Structures are given as structure tokens and as C-alpha cells.
Write a protein that binds this ligand. Structure first.
Ligand SMILES: *[C@@H]1O[C@H](CO)[C@@H](O[C@@H]2O[C@H](CO)[C@@H](O[C@@H]3O[C@H](CO)[C@@H](O)[C@H](O)[C@@H]3O)[C@H](O)[C@H]2NC(C)=O)[C@H](O)[C@H]1NC(C)=O
Ligand SMILES: *[C@@H]1O[C@H](CO)[C@@H](O[C@@H]2O[C@H](CO)[C@@H](O[C@@H]3O[C@H](CO)[C@@H](O)[C@H](O)[C@@H]3O)[C@H](O)[C@H]2NC(C)=O)[C@H](O)[C@H]1NC(C)=O
Ligand SMILES: *[C@@H]1O[C@H](CO)[C@@H](O[C@@H]2O[C@H](CO)[C@@H](O)[C@H](O)[C@H]2NC(C)=O)[C@H](O)[C@H]1NC(C)=O
Ligand SMILES: *[C@@H]1O[C@H](CO)[C@@H](O)[C@H](O)[C@H]1NC(C)=O
Ligand SMILES: *[C@@H]1O[C@H](CO)[C@@H](O)[C@H](O)[C@H]1NC(C)=O
Ligand SMILES: *[C@@H]1O[C@H](CO)[C@@H](O)[C@H](O)[C@H]1NC(C)=O
Ligand SMILES: *[C@@H]1O[C@H](CO)[C@@H](O)[C@H](O)[C@H]1NC(C)=O
Ligand SMILES: *[C@H]1O[C@H](CO)[C@@H](O)[C@H](O)[C@H]1NC(C)=O
Ligand SMILES: *[C@H]1O[C@H](CO)[C@@H](O)[C@H](O)[C@H]1NC(C)=O
Ligand SMILES: [Zn+2]
Lengths: 677, 136, 67
């Protein structure tokens, strides 16, 4: 594999060098021009040798740091957990606020801080690479995937994509808000006294490490638990559905709309069943288009509904691959980075309908779906599809603003957590300064992948489904639509599938949905039955959130320092060293209080005095946690008593006297005035 | 030379010796020198090193209270400290730089413990009282 | 017990392999010092309180046996 990949890469780079002989300024053929563009992009080759090697080194280092990062329980530092096993289980199964908080904070303080400087260098180098390629920044290079030029009407500028996102997002906010409120209302019953009905959700309670999906929250938020979900896996087992006939059923489904049959060698070369322990193979279901009419599917298929839907999705992927077989090699791909996954996913969306399950025989014909079952299914869908949209948009917006330089290098986290609060409605459980690199802890950020693809694909699929449900003449709710036995819908879809990259993606959209740009309305049309119910379920609850409540905001003591007044001239500047000294002083005061009053020896440290909302006035909020137990916060009363006890030493450390160093809640006593005899 | 001495140590060359006299400088109302005071002193020394490395060499080095190694603690409150690199134990900040750092920020260290240059002696860092002004 | 190089905290060494090789083969004063101090500050401090309790309990056991 290494040899073949190196040979292919060398061939591609030498062909790219050769292709420069024909400038695009004189090319008139559209297909030729775009193929030359594909074979003419320099990529990382435009940098110097040293810079290119440094870029490859930092990319590889970030990848390995993400892959092999370990966090360990402070009690048994001999046991440590990776990310993929254990930590994901902790974040997706535990109901302990303390345990989930520990997992979240440990992962973001043991792998975030290692990724901060590497990410800074990565941003600088990638921006240089993009600018050397006549892009204003790296984010512009990423957005360039949607660029369309010279078509007289279908042109789609790079800078337009941003707008087409933001405008679209403005129409999802009414739905998401209600969902947010509902989830919040349901999460207060599982983590009481931790979630405020007026504020945002804590970051670690979202059923996933980053909150990217809300699927694992479903068990805590099911609308009608007493009604079971539609499961036909047992029916498959009873009818003896091996991992050979489900693909046959999916093929029948694809042909029912007019799509062509599978190739003869497709079944022979496939790996539809696990090869056992004798042969080691990957189990991620993947589609392969080896070329020259060679299409294969790899999947460790079991007997489950999830495997059935995954098989349908993969067969959609390979159907798309086969559709543009006639196109030249540089054209053998989807319209953009989002089309392929949307095309694959609409098949899974259609096949999961209870109507199709009844028609295939897995669902008994004597099964009438209740409106409750529809609500449950819709909420399960929304926790995945709608939950990820605000997160995706916020992440991509932050990355674009970082690449463009609109966010200073010393204001990354302060802006990132300021965005999640007012866009996603998610608040950090403990404050993070500029040392942390939370966004780099996600896989797609540290491994240098474009993230906007997951946004548009979410929209496109619905725009497809609705269109394919219009031609099929479906009257009821969209979530019940099925496209089986609809040759017109299949023909309409194939009209776009065969195009591949030969045409602008706008034109491909026009050939299915009849529009030129992405429109979010079908998504809302899909979730309208749920939306109403959500609106009915939030009569008393307060829909929305405030960007001021935080889980640590109740135990915070607010410090305000006035240097220039108390010292006049000869006053030092309040740099980070002074903050270090202040945190050390507070930790010392806490140690003294716990030793001289409660007779307990507690080893506080400067990293246990968490500081937030630093402002130029030198006014911030601090609070002190347990020595190694992040979930444990020393209650404010004890902190106030500790500060009162040793306020003189703190005042002397900074040469301030009780008026320039105000703790806003600790009022000093001047002392009784003695009276003469 | 056959044999050995129980006084040489690999860190003994870069050690700065601190001697603290609480009871003289404060008389009564003098606190006790428990481990919390040692923690505060090490934090103060680390802060001084940070300030020196930021304001003179223009390097941001993240010193910490665990990087100020303390030995030979005695009831007089007289000990030897030396500062290593932020995470590189084999690297010891040479004594000259530590002395310059202490001279630069000795006022803050003195104020932290309410001592004045006579009860907090660094045994090698001699203070300057200041020139006496002369009339016209 | 594991100790890890401060440069690549993702790579960590046990005692029986690696650390013994480092201590018995390296000629770098810095590397050997790192190994020694890391082993004694990552497994010594974890063993202090347990050893105190162990001393107390073993002394009680011996005294109950007329030693
Ligand atoms: C870190 O600090 C937190 C406190 O903020 C500790 O959580 C506390 O753990 C104890 C021990 O499990 C809990 O007591 C138990 O409560 C459950 C709940 O019903 C009960 O079934 C048990 O019988 C026992 O009473 C306590 O409630 C809990 N406090 C909070 C606020 O969650 C945590 O243990 C500390 N971590 C470590 C490693 O010590
Ligand atoms: C921790 O600090 C020590 C210094 O106390 C660092 O050791 C130093 O490492 C550099 C880099 O290898 C050495 O320079 C090299 O010296 C060898 C010896 O001949 C030479 O072959 C090389 O060309 C280069 O000049 C330096 O001598 C050495 N200093 C000492 C006192 O050993 C160590 O690298 C630091 N650790 C980390 C992780 O940075
Ligand atoms: C742009 O070039 C392509 C590639 O030649 C043209 O498409 C056809 O490609 C086949 C196979 O390469 C040739 O045998 C044909 O002669 C090409 N032309 C036609 C009309 O079939 C395409 O036509 C060209 N477009 C323009 C506007 O000239
Ligand atoms: C790529 O780099 C070459 C020089 O290495 C330069 O001539 C060319 O303009 C750059 N861009 C393209 C699209 O080839
Ligand atoms: C597809 O192939 C299967 C057997 O491989 C065959 O039974 C079926 O009829 C074919 N499809 C059509 C539309 O003929
Ligand atoms: C289902 O329909 C019944 C009958 O109108 C109604 O009372 C109930 O509220 C509906 N529930 C949902 C979730 O639509
Ligand atoms: C589609 O056509 C097949 C073949 O006639 C039929 O069995 C099935 O009921 C039809 N409807 C659906 C939803 O599959
Ligand atoms: C003010 O009164 C408090 C106790 O009420 C005391 O600790 C404090 O020292 C007094 N302030 C003086 C005497 O300056
Ligand atoms: C003594 O002189 C030094 C420089 O030689 C100076 O930094 C220090 O402040 C002086 N002490 C005073 C003025 O009290
Ligand atoms: Zn896929």
C-alpha cells in the first residue's frame, strides 16, 4: 500500500507540474478547463522545503497526540484511558455529573494544551500556503470547493458560501431553540440542581465528548417511553436473514425506482460477512470504486436494523459511483464534498420508514403507527440531525475567523466559548484561558479536515428527499415518505447522479430540486410535526437561553484591583506573572484556613484557583476547587472566611490596602475607636 | 583521596542560602514557619524568576512552585534553594541569573512576608540603602 | 508504574523494560538523572502513605505476637 500510494502521489505531482504548460486564460472548453484546474492545483508543493517538512511534522504530531492521548483518574494514576475506548463509553453512558465532568476536563487539559502551540504553527503555515496559492487565507481555500466560475448565472463565489450558510442558519434557530429548551427541561430531572432553566446547557452533559451529536441523550429525553421503538431485528432473526439477503433486498429497493442492477463481480468480490479471526480486516463499512467498472463493498455485517440501513447507505454510495462511470477520471466524483453523503443518506432515510418495513415483511401488516411513535422517531432523528447543525456552523465559523486573522492569537478560547454560549447554547463547566485549545480536541480539527461538509450535506439530503417525494406523489407527512416503485423519482435522481463533477453543483441541484442554491425549508418541512409538539410542550418553560449563567457562577468571588489609584506612579503592570502570584496567594490563604481551623492538611495549588472574566480594570471572578477533584468546588462561605483570615498577607503581597483590592462581599473592619478614661 | 565527605552534593554549587529571622523583625504577632509559608516562599521565588525571564531576556518560561528545590531546612529558618528548568530536571538555572532575578524583585518578596532586607538575607545578595542626597 | 518523557508525554516507560535499559546502558548524565528522579517522584510519592500505614499495621501485628 505504501509503495502504490507513493507511486500514485509522484505521478500526480509530476502531472501537476506538467499541466502548467496550458494556462486557463486561453482554455475555452469547460470540461478541459476544470480538469486542468484539478490537475494544476499546487497544494503544499508551493511552500519551501523547510516549511513543507515542518508542516508535515506538525500535522503528524497532532494526529498522533489525538490518537494516543491518555487521561488518568487522579485516585489510581496507574490506570489510564484512551479516547476511543473507555472515555467515549464514560461520556456516552455515565449519569454521574462528577465523573463526566472529570472526563471532559481531563481530556481538554491533557490533550488540548499539548495541541495549542502546534495548532498555532499549523494556522500560520497553512495560511502561508494558501496565500502563496492566491487565496486570501486557508479558509478561503477550504471554501473553494464550492466555487463555480464562467457559467453565466450558475457562478457561485467562495465568499457567498458564508452568507448562504448564515442566512440559512437564521431559519433553523426557531426550531433548535425549542429543542434546546425541551432537552434542558428533560435534563433537569436527571441532573437536578446543576442545570438552570434560564441558562445554557453544561458542555459535558450532552451525551458526547464534544456535544457534536445529541444521540446518546435520547434515553434521558424520550417523549413517550412507554411506547417501544420500531425494531425488526428480531423479525429478521426469525426469518433467518443472513448477511447475504439484506443486500439483495437493498438491490431490489434500488431497482424499484429504476436504478440499474449490481455488477456480476460485485457479489463475488464483496466482503459482506466478517471473515472471522482467521483473516484480519477492517470493519468500517466502506465503498470501493477501484475503476474500470470495479465496485465493491466492505462491511462486517451482522443481523440488525442498523446494519440494514448502513447497507442501504453504502449501496447508495456505490450507485452514485457507478452513475458517473462514463465520466473522465478527474470527473469521477460527486458534485462537491457534500453530495455523496447526502445521496447515500437519503436511501437510509427512506428505508427506515415503517411503510417500507411493512411492505418488505419485517413489520407485521397488523401494525398501525401512533402519532406518539412518530413523535418518538422524529425526536430521535432530530437529536442527531438538528443537534449537530449549530455545532457544525459554530465550529466552522470559528475556524474561518481564526484563519482570516479576525481573532487575535491571544483571544482564541475567550472568543470560542463566547460563540458556543450564544449560538449553540452550551456553557463550559469550568473556565478555560488561552492555554487550552478545546477546538483542537475534536478529530476533524486536529487532523486538518474541512468541517462545513457536514452542514450542507444535512440540508441537501432533505432538499433531495422532498423533491423525490414530489415526483413520487406522496401526500402525507414527509417523514413517512417512501420512494419505492417510483420510476420518475429514480430518473430525476439519476439525471443528477450521472453528471458527477462534469457540471457545476448548482446545476446538479437544479436538476433535482429545481433550485440553484441550498434552501433549509425542506428540513423544517421534515420536522414540522415535531416542531408543533415541541411548541406545545414548552408552554411553561422559558424558551431560549442567557449568555451569562455558568455552572461555576454561584461560588465565584469577584476581585477588583485598582493599582494606579493606590500606588499612583511606580505602579507595576498586571501581566500573567501577577496573576500567578495572586493565585498562589489565594491557594496559600486556603491552605492556612484549612490547617488552622479545620485541622486538615489540604495541598492546594496555583492551578486550583480558577480565574474567569479577566478584564482591563483588573476585575475577575475566581473560585477554588478541591486539590485534585475538579467536580468538588469549595463553597463560597469557606472561601470568604479563608480570605478574611489571611487578607492582610494578600494585601501586603501586592502593596494594596483593602480599598484597591476589593473582594466584593468581604467588607473589612477598620477597628473600634478607643475612648479615653 | 580515599574516602568521602558528607557535605558535597551535585546541587551544592548553584544553591542560594536563605536565612529568615521572623521573631526579630516582627517581635510579637509573628507567624509560625509551617509548610504553607514554604509554599508561599517557593511561589514567590518562581514569580521572581518568571519576571526576570520575561522583562530581561524576553522569554516566557513557565516556572512553578515545584521548580524551586529546597534543602537543608533548619529551625533557624535557614535553607538552600535552587531553581531548575520548567520541566527539565537536569537543567539548573545558573546561580548568577538567580541572583539577578532576586535582586530585581526582592522588594516584592520582602513585602510578601513583611520582612525588610535584614531578616530575609540571601547570603550573597547585598542590598543598597540608597545614596544620601546632599543639599545645594 | 509509568514515567513519561516531558517532551512526548504520549510515550511512557515501565520499570522492567526500558527504564532498566536506560539506567544500565545510557551514558548521558541528563537522561539518567531524568530516569532516576522521574521514577522516584512518580512511584515514591504514591508509595509514601501506603508505606506509613503498612509500618503501623505490621508493627501492631508483631507486637500482638509478643515481638
Ligand atoms: C469529588 O467531590 C465530589 C463532591 O463534589 C464527590 O462526590 C460525592 O461522592 C460521595 C461518595 O459517593 C457522595 O455520597 C454518596 O451519595 C450517593 C447519592 O445518593 C449515595 O448513594 C451514597 O450513599 C453517598 O451518600 C456525594 O453525594 C457526592 N457529592 C456530589 C455533590 O456529587 C466525589 O466523590 C469526589 N471525588 C473523589 C475522587 O473523592
Ligand atoms: C535539559 O537541559 C540540558 C542542559 O543542562 C540539556 O542538555 C544539553 O543538550 C544539548 C543538545 O544535545 C547539548 O548540546 C550538544 O552537546 C553535544 C555534546 O558534545 C554535542 O555533540 C551537540 O552537537 C550539541 O552541542 C548540551 O551540551 C547539553 N548540555 C548539558 C549540560 O548536558 C538538555 O537537552 C535539556 N533537555 C531537553 C529535553 O531540552
Ligand atoms: C471538451 O472536450 C471533451 C473531450 O474531448 C469533448 O467531449 C467529447 O469527448 C470524446 C472523448 O474524449 C471525443 O471523442 C469527442 O470528440 C468530444 N466531443 C464531443 C462533441 O463528443 C467536449 O465535446 C468538448 N467540449 C467543447 C465545448 O468543445
Ligand atoms: C504553482 O507553482 C508554480 C511554481 O512552482 C507556479 O509557476 C504556478 O503559477 C503555481 N500555480 C499553479 C496553479 O500551477
Ligand atoms: C438483477 O439481478 C438479479 C440476479 O442477480 C435478477 O434476479 C434480477 O432480475 C435483476 N434485475 C432485473 C431488473 O432484472
Ligand atoms: C395523538 O392523537 C390524539 C387524538 O387526537 C391526541 O389526543 C394526542 O394528543 C396526539 N398525540 C400526539 C403526540 O400527537
Ligand atoms: C412495490 O412493488 C412491489 C412489486 O410489485 C410490491 O410487492 C410492493 O408492495 C410495492 N410497494 C412497496 C412500497 O414496495
Ligand atoms: C475589625 O474587626 C474584625 C473582627 O470583627 C477584626 O478581625 C479586624 O482586625 C478589625 N480591624 C482592625 C482592628 O483594624
Ligand atoms: C541601591 O542601589 C541599587 C543599584 O546600585 C538600586 O537598585 C537600589 O534601589 C538602591 N537602594 C535604594 C535606593 O534604597
Ligand atoms: Zn458514507
Amino acid at each position: 500500500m505504501n509503495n502504490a500510494g507513493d507511486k500514485w502521489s509522484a505521478f500526480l505531482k509530476e502531472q501537476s507540474t506538467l499541466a502548467q504548460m496550458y494556462p486557463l486564460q486561453e482554455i475555452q472548453n469547460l470540461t478541459v478547463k476544470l480538469q486542468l484546474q484539478a490537475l494544476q492545483q499546487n497544494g503544499s508543493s508551493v511552500l519551501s522545503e523547510d516549511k513543507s517538512k515542518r508542516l508535515n511534522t506538525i500535522l503528524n504530531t497532532m494526529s498522533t497526540i489525538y490518537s494516543t492521548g491518555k487521561v488518568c483518574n487522579p485516585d489510581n494514576p496507574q490506570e489510564c484511558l484512551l479516547l476511543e475506548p473507555g472515555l467515549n463509553e464514560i461520556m456516552a453512558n455515565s449519569l454521574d455529573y462528577n465523573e463526566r465532568l472529570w472526563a471532559w476536563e481531563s481530556w481538554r487539559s491533557e490533550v488540548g494544551k499539548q495541541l495549542r502551540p502546534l495548532y498555532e504553527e499549523y494556522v500560520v503555515l497553512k495560511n502561508e500556503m494558501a496565500r502563496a496559492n492566491h487565496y486570501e487565507d486557508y479558509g478561503d481555500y477550504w471554501r473553494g470547493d464550492y466555487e463555480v466560475n464562467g457559467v453565466d448565472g450558475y457562478d457561485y463565489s467562495r465568499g457567498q458560501l458564508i452568507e448562504d450558510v448564515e442566512h440559512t442558519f437564521e431559519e433553523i434557530k426557531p426550531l433548535y431553540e425549542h429543542l434546546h429548551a425541551y432537552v434542558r427541561a428533560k435534563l433537569m430531572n436527571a441532573y437536578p440542581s446543576y442545570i438552570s432553566p434560564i441558562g445554557c446547557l453544561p458542555a459535558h452533559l450532552l451525551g458526547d465528548m464534544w456535544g457534536r451529536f445529541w444521540t446518546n441523550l435520547y434515553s434521558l429525553t424520550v417523549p413517550f417511553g412507554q411506547k417501544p421503538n420500531i425494531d425488526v431485528t428480531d423479525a429478521m432473526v426469525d426469518q433467518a436473514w443472513d448477511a447475504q439477503r439484506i443486500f439483495k433486498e437493498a438491490e431490489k429497493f434500488f431497482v424499484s425506482v429504476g436504478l440499474p442492477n449490481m455488477t456480476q463481480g460485485f457479489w463475488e468480490n464483496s466482503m459482506l460477512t466478517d471473515p472471522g479471526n482467521v483473516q484480519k480486516a477492517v470493519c468500517h463499512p466502506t465503498a470501493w470504486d477501484l475503476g474500470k467498472g470495479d465496485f465493491r463493498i466492505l462491511m462486517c455485517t451482522k443481523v440488525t436494523m442498523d446494519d440494514f440501513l448502513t447497507a442501504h447507505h453504502e449501496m447508495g454510495h456505490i450507485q452514485y459511483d457507478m452513475a458517473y462511470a462514463a465520466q473522465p477520471f478527474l470527473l469521477r466524483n460527486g458534485a462537491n464534498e457534500g453530495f455523496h453523503e447526502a445521496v447515500g443518506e437519503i436511501m437510509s432515510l427512506s428505508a427506515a420508514t415503517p411503510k417500507h418495513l411493512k411492505s418488505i415483511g419485517l413489520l407485521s401488516p397488523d401494525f398501525q403507527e401512533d402519532n406518539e411513535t412518530e413523535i418518538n422517531f422524529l425526536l430521535k432523528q432530530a437529536l442527531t440531525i438538528v443537534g449537530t447543525l449549530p455545532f457544525t456552523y459554530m465550529l466552522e465559523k470559528w475556524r474561518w475567523m481564526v484563519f482570516k486573522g479576525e481573532i487575535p492569537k491571544d483571544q482564541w478560547m475567550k472568543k470560542w466559548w463566547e460563540m458556543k454560549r450564544e449560538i449553540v447554547g452550551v456553557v463550559e463547566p469550568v473556565p478555560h484561558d488561552e492555554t487550552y485549545c478545546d477546538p483542537a480536541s475534536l478529530f476533524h480539527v486536529s487532523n486538518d479536515y474541512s468541517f462545513i461538509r457536514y452542514y450542507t450535506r444535512t440540508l441537501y439530503q432533505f432538499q433531495f428527499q422532498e423533491a423525490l417525494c414530489q415526483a413520487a406523489k406522496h401526500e402525507g407527512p414527509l417523514h413517512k415518505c417512501d420512494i419505492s416503485n417510483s420510476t420518475e423519482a429514480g430518473q430525476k435522481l439519476f439525471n443528477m447522479l450521472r453528471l458527477g463533477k462534469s457540471e457545476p453543483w448548482t446545476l446538479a441541484l437544479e436538476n433535482v430540486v429545481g433550485a440553484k442554491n441550498m434552501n433549509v425549508r425542506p428540513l423544517l418541512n421534515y420536522f414540522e410535526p415535531l416542531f408543533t409538539w415541541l411548541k406545545d410542550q414548552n408552554k411553561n418553560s422559558f424558551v431560549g437561553w442567557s449568555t451569562d449563567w455558568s455552572p461555576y457562577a454561584d461560588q465565584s468571588i469577584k476581585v477588583r484591583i485598582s493599582l494606579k489609584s493606590a500606588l499612583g506612579d511606580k505602579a507595576y503592570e498586571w501581566n500573567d506573572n501577577e496573576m500567578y502570584l495572586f493565585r498562589s496567594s489565594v491557594a496559600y490563604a486556603m491552605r492556612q484556613y484549612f490547617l488552622k481551623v479545620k485541622n486538615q492538611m489540604i495541598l492546594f495549588g496555583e492551578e486550583d484557583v480558577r480565574v474567569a472574566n479577566l478584564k482591563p480594570r483588573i476585575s475577575f471572578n475566581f473560585f477554588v476547587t478541591a486539590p485534585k477533584n475538579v467536580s468538588d468546588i469549595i463553597p463560597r462561605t469557606e472561601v470568604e472566611k479563608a480570605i478574611r483570615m489571611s487578607r492582610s498577607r494578600i494585601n501586603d503581597a501586592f502593596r494594596l490596602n483593602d480599598n484597591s483590592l476589593e473582594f466584593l462581599g468581604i467588607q473589612p473592619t477598620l477597628g473600634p475607636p478607643n475612648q479615653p478614661p
